[PDB]
């Protein structure tokens, strides 16, 4: 909710970026997706068209920090 404190969604965004920085560190092949990297990228890029702007900007930032990582 909008009147919840800001550290909830801020800590969630930082945790999502840190988790995607951890689990996408070993992927080097550009066409490497087997079962679960495909689903993680699917749930990220299917949510760029959300109603909430926070999750839109978080999905854009998480797509940017896994294209600069690998």
Curated annotation (Swiss-Prot):
Domain remark from Swiss-Prot or TrEMBL: The C-terminal domain (2233-2836) is essential for its ability to interact with activators.
Family named by the database record: Belongs to the PI3/PI4-kinase family. TRA1 subfamily.
Function of the molecule: Essential scaffold subunit of the transcription coactivator SAGA complex. SAGA acts as a general cofactor required for essentially all RNA polymerase II transcription. At the promoters, SAGA is required for transcription pre-initiation complex (PIC) recruitment. It influences RNA polymerase II transcriptional activity through different activities such as TBP interaction (via core/TAF module) and promoter selectivity, interaction with transcription activators (via Tra1/SPT module), and chromatin modification through histone acetylation (via HAT module) and deubiquitination (via DUB module).
Note: Although strongly related to the PI3/PI4-kinase family, it lacks the typical motifs that constitute the catalytic site of PI3/PI4-kinase proteins, suggesting that it may lack such activity.
Residues of the full protein shown: 1249 to 1318 of 3744
Protein name in the entry: SAGA complex/NuA4 acetyltransferase complex subunit TRA1
HEAT repeats: 35-70
Assembly and binders: Component of the 1.8 MDa SAGA (Spt-Ada-Gcn5 acetyltransferase) complex, which is composed of 19 subunits TRA1, SPT7, TAF5, NGG1/ADA3, SGF73, SPT20/ADA5, SPT8, TAF12, TAF6, HFI1/ADA1, UBP8, GCN5, ADA2, SPT3, SGF29, TAF10, TAF9, SGF11 and SUS1.
Gene name in the database record: TRA1
Compartments, as annotated in UniProt: Nucleus
């Amino acid at each position: 909710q909008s009147e919840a404190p800001s550290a909830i969604t801020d800590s969630a965004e930082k945790l999502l970026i840190d988790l995607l920085s951890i689990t996408f560190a070993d992927v080097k092949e550009e066409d490497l997706g087997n079962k679960v990297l495909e689903n993680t990228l699917t749930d990220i890029v299917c949510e760029l068209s959300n109603a909430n702007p926070k999750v839109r900007n978080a999905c854009q930032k998480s797509l940017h920090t896994i294209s600069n990582l690998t």
